Amino acid sequence: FYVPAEPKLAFVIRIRGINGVSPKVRKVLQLLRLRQIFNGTFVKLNKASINMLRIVEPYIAWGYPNLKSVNELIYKRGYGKINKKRIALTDNTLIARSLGKYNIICMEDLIHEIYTVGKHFKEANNFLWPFKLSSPRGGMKKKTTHFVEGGDAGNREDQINRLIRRMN
Amino acid sequence: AKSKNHTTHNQSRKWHRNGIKKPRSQRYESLKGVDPKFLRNMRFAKKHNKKGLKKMQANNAKAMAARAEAIKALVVSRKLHRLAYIAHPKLGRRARARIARGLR
Amino acid sequence: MKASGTLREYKVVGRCLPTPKCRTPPLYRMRIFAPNHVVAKSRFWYFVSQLKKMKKSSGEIVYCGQVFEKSPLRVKNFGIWLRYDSRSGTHNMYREYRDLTTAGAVTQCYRDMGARHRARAHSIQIMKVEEIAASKCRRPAVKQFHDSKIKFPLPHRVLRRQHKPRFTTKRPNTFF
Amino acid sequence: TNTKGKRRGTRYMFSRPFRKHGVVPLATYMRIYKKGDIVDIKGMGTVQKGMPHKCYHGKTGRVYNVTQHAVGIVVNKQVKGKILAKRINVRIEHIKHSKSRDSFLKRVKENDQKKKEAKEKGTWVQLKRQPAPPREAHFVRTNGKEPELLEPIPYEFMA
RNA sequence: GCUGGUUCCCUCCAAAGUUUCCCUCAGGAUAGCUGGCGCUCUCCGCAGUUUUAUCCGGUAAAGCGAAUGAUUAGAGGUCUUGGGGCCGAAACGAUCUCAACCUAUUCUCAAACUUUAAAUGGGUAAGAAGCCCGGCUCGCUGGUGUGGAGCCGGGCGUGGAAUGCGAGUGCCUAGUGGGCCACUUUUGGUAAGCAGAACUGGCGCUGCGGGAUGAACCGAACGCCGGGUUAAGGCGCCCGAUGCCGACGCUCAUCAGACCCCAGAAAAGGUGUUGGUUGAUAUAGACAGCAGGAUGGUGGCCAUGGAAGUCGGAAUCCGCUAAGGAGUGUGUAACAACUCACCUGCCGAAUCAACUAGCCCUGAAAAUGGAUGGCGCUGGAGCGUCGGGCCCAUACCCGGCCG
RNA sequence: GACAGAAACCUCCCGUGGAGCAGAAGGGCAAAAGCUCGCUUGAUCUUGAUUUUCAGUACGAAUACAGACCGUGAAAGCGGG
RNA sequence: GCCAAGCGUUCAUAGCGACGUCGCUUUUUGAUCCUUCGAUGUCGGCUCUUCCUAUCAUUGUGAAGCAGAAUUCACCAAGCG
RNA sequence: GUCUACGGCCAUACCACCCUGAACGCGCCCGAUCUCGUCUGAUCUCGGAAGCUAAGCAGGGUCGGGCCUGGUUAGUACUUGGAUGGGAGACCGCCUGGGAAUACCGGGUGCUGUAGGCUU
C-alpha cells in the first residue's frame, strides 16, 4: 500500500453567526480571521492549527482545496491588504509592491505559494484579505451538525471543493 | 423583603472588557525589601567605586589596544535565472541595452 | 451515522503507527457501508476502537476503497446479522433480503429497521452480511419467490398522474 | 458564608504524601538559590515556619531576596480583574527549582554552539522549532499475509 | 433615604444590578462597568488561542482480600475464656455442644473515609532587559582576590514555536449598586412558574425569519434601496413553496395520530397486527379433526366407622402389550360409571411453547361550547428511514446613495 | 512473679503511633513537637519591609530580616510566647 | 388501579384483600408570594340559572356465597328527581 | 570481591526463618584506679586485649509476605465540546477529542559519592 502524504493546506469557512458564542471559540475565530459569516481563509496544517480547528469545530466547515479551487478563489475574490485597505487585485504591480521582497511577483506565483505553501506562506496568506463568500447556492444540508452525521460542520476531507464551487 | 446574597455572574465579562493586563515590568526593579546588611555593603561598594577609577581606564586602554593589534594581525532553472537577472533593474541594465542595440 | 441515499461498500484498511516497541503492527481491514469515504473512515475508527486498543490519533488509514459487486445483474438472497439498541436494551437480529447488490441489501435493511422498529442508523450496528444459497433462506417473505414458474397479476392499479388532467370528464379505469 | 481563616481548606493540600511522613531530607536545605532563579512554591506541613499562603501553592515566581533561612520571591496573583506581582517570604522547605527554565537554557546553549560552529562551513541551519508537521508519504509492506478481517461481535448480557 | 412630573432635531460611543464599610437592607461611600479630553510613540510589544517543556490539584471514577467508620453469610482451628449438660468426690481427663475468640474467604457501602486516580482546568518558560569574555569596588562573606553583589569595557542578529493584532500612558467623569432566564454542575424541599450557588450565553437595553399565539427557544443581530442566494422552519387550502406519474415499510382508533423549549399521563395487560430470540417435533408421515380400547398383581400396603385410582400423607414397581398412570378430572358413606394420559385407524404439511420488541387498544373521571392553529386528512394531509425539486429574513454576495 | 483478684507493683517480648501534644476539628510530630530532669525569662528594647481579610484601607494575627541586651548548649545553633 | 399472603365452613380473585407498588383530582388543608395596597366589597342564609359525573332513585343490561323477597359488585347513561 | 568512617536518594534497602563468612576491620568480650553516671560499671564514661563468630553485621536462599515496575481489567468506567437525538420520565445512544482503578498473571529485591584499609 502507498499512503500519500497527508495534506498540509486547508480551507476554512465560518458556517455559523455571531450570536451566542463562547469566549474561547470567539478568540480562535478572531485568530483565524473569520469574523463574519461565510468568510474563508487558507490555513496551513500542523499540530497547533489542527488543535485550534478542533476547538472551533462546531462553527466551521473546512477541508483540503484543489488547485482549481485555489485559482477560482484567488482570481474571482482576490483582494489584497495594502496599507491596511481592501484593494482589488486588478494587476500585478499591487502584488509586486507588497510582496516582491519575497520574490513572488505575479498572481501565478502567489497561487503557487498558497498551493505549495513554500517558505513565505505566512506573508502571502496575511497579504490576502479574507474571502467573502456568497450563500451556498442550492442550500446546505444541516448547519448545526457534523458532516459525518449528515451535517455541514466539521472536516470534509475533499468535498470542500464541491462546497467552494457551489458557494462561488 | 429577602434579596439576592452573592453572585459573580457578569464579573468575567466586566474584567475582560478592559482586559486582564499582566503587571507592568521595567528593566530595573526597586531595592526595597532586600536584606539591610546586604544593602549597606552594596551601597558602600557603590560609594567606593570612584577610588579604583584610574586602574580601570588604564586597563581598558591596554585592552582596546591589544584587541586592535589582534584584529589588525587577523586582517530555479538557468532560463529563469537569466530572465530574472535581465529583469533586474540595476543588474540587467547592460543586458537590456545590449538587446536593444541588437534589435537596432 | 445517517443512512443518506443508497449506501456503498468500502474496504477500509488501517494500522497503528510504528512504535519503538514493534517495528510494524498488524494490518486490519473491514467492510463498511456508508454514504462516502469520509464517514466510512469515521466508522472504521469507531469499530476498530471498539474492538482493538486503537484510536484515530494513534493509528492511520492505509487504504480506503469502494468494493464493486461481482454480479450486479443476477438477483441474490442476502442474510444479514446485526445488532441494535431499542428503547430498552439491545438485541441481536438476523434478517433476509433479496436484491442485486450487497449495498442495496444493506440500505434496504436500514430502511426496514427504521420502518419496523423505529431504530436509527446510529443505533444500528451491522456486523455480518453473506450471500445465502436459495435453499438456506429461512424467511417466508423471501422463500415464496423461489418458484421457477412464478406468476401473479397486478390487481388494483391505483391511478397516478392525477393532477395532469385535473378536471377530467371520465371516471378513471383501474382494471388493466 | 465561610471563615476567613488562614489554613481553611488546606486539609489535603498541606498534608504529606503517603508513606512519606517524618524527617525532611537534607538536599532540600542544601540546594542554593541565586537571585533571579525561577522557583516553584509547594507548601509542606512538616514545617510550620515561613509557610506560604494557600493561594500560592502550585505557583511559580522569581527570587529577588535571599536571606538566612528563607527567600523573598515575586509571584503573580490574580484578584478580581487585575493581576498583582507581589512579594512573599518563603522558608526553603516549601521551595523547588523549576526545570522549565533549565530546558530553555539547554536549548539556547545548544543553538549557540550550533550557530558558532557550522557558520564558517557556510551551510544553512534551522534553529527555530517548527511544530509537528503532517506525515509524509510512505509504503506499507504486507509481506505475505493478507490483512485479517474484523467484525463486530454479537451482544451478550454479561451484566 | 418616599410618590408624581421634568419641554427641539440629528450624529457618535454606550452600561449596572457586583466587591468592602456604614443603626445599612426603598439609602449612601468605595472598587468595578461608561464617556470625554488628551499626551508619548509606531507605521518592538500584546493575546478570554493553540503547540513544545515544566510543575501544581484529590473532584468524577474506583477500593474495602489496603487504614478509619460501617456491614451479610457460611467455613477451619483451639483451650484462649464463659454457658447447657454427661461420665467423672475431681481431673486443660474426656464427650458433645452453644457461644464468644483467632485465621483464611464472602455480600453491600461512605458529603464531613481512602492506597490509587482521570477529562476539563491553574501557574511558568519559549532570548538583545540574552549569552560570552576581560578588568575595578565592598565596611557583607571568607583557609584561599574565597563567595556574592555592584560597577566599568569589549564581542556576538538566523529577533531563536504557530496564528492574529499598532501600542503605552494621565486626568476629569455620569449612570448603576431591586435583576431575571436557559444547556450542563449543584444545596434545602414531596414538589413548585419555590428558595439558594458555579460556568457560559442571553433578556433587561433588541428590532428581524420560524415556533399559530409568547421578554429570554431555533436562526440571525439592524443606515435608505435594486438584483441574486441561503439559515432555522417548511411546500393539501387558509398561506409563498412537491399540481414529484418520489422510494421502502408500519398503523384502523365507538378517545386515532400529527414535530426542541411546550403546554399532559404511569405501573400492568391484549390470541389486534408486524418483526425477532430461544427451545421443542415433522415424510419411521407432525398440530387439528373424525374413532377404539384407560388393562392384572392390587379393593397394595402405615391409616379411616367407610375410601377400593378419583377427600387426605410417605410410597408409587412389575407381566399383558401398538396402550393404559398403584392414576388428570366428573360424580358416589365406598363403589359402580364416564372421562383424561398411551398408542393405533382415516387425511396429509409445516406445527407448538416461552420470551422479546414496534404501531394500535384497555388502564384514562370536572365542572360556559372547544381546539394537531382551523378546515380537514386514512393508496395519508398519520409514524419511521430516505431522494430530488421548490419557497423567503433587516443574514450572505454584487451595485447605487447618506453619514 | 507472696498476699494480688477483672483491676496496685516488678520483669521480659511484640508493638508506624493505633497514645500524647490545655480546649472544637483538621493537619503535623518518635534518639520528637510526646515523657522526665537541669538551667533560665526571647512573654524584654527598637526602626523599617511583607502576608492574610482587602478597597490591595484599618485593626487583629502572622512571616522574613536588621540593630541592642540576654538565656541555653561542648558546639553548630535555637529562642524575641 | 397492579401483585396475591390470607378471609370467605370448601375456594386467592361472588364479595374482600395485608406486606408492597403505580396513578388521577383540585370541592380539604398546607407550601410559595407571580397579579391586585391613587381599594377587584370577606362568612353564612335567601333567590335563580347553568354545568360536571366520581350514579342515590328512575329506563336498558351483565355477575353473585341471586330459590322467591330484599340486597351487594359492574356496564351504557346526567334525560328527570 | 569486600569492609570501615562520613553520607545522597530513602523498602528493588522492610519483615519472618534457614545457610555461609578467608584477611583487615566492625563487634561481642575482660575490668573499675582515674574522668564520669547509676538502686545496680545493666546503660553512659574510663582502662584494656584472655577468648569468640554464638549474636549483631555482610553475602545467599524461600513455587515467602511486603515494596518497585509491566500485562490484563479496558477503549471498560468517567469526561471536553455538539445536535429541533431517543425517551412520560428516570436515563440512554451517536459525533468530536481525552481516558482510569481493584481482583487475576508476570519480572526485579538496593544503586551510589568522598576518604581510608584488606584480598603478601
Ligand SMILES: COC(=O)C[C@@](O)(CCC(C)(C)O)C(=O)O[C@@H]1C(OC)=C[C@]23CCCN2CCc2cc4c(cc2[C@H]13)OCO4
Ligand atoms: C371599599 O373597599 C372595600 O371593598 C373594602 C376593603 O378595604 C376592606 C378590607 C377588608 C376586607 C380587610 O375588610 C377590601 O375589601 O379589601 C380589599 C379590596 O378592596 C376593594 C379588594 C380585595 C382585593 C382583591 C380582592 N379583595 C376583595 C375583598 C377583600 C377581602 C379580604 C381581604 C382583602 C380584600 C381586598 O382580606 C381579608 O378578606
Ligand SMILES: [Mg+2]
Ligand atoms: Mg442561537
Ligand SMILES: [Mg+2]
Ligand atoms: Mg434556486
Ligand SMILES: [Mg+2]
Ligand atoms: Mg445551539
Ligand SMILES: [Mg+2]
Ligand atoms: Mg441587591
Ligand SMILES: [Mg+2]
Ligand atoms: Mg430608604
Ligand SMILES: [Mg+2]
Ligand atoms: Mg455604627
Ligand SMILES: [Mg+2]
Ligand atoms: Mg420604588
Ligand SMILES: [Mg+2]
Ligand atoms: Mg475536597
Ligand SMILES: [Mg+2]
Ligand atoms: Mg463517588
Ligand SMILES: [Mg+2]
Ligand atoms: Mg432561583
Ligand SMILES: [Mg+2]
Ligand atoms: Mg430596569
Ligand SMILES: [Mg+2]
Ligand atoms: Mg448589551
Ligand SMILES: [Mg+2]
Ligand atoms: Mg435579541
Ligand SMILES: [Mg+2]
Ligand atoms: Mg406551539
Ligand SMILES: [Mg+2]
Ligand atoms: Mg433582497
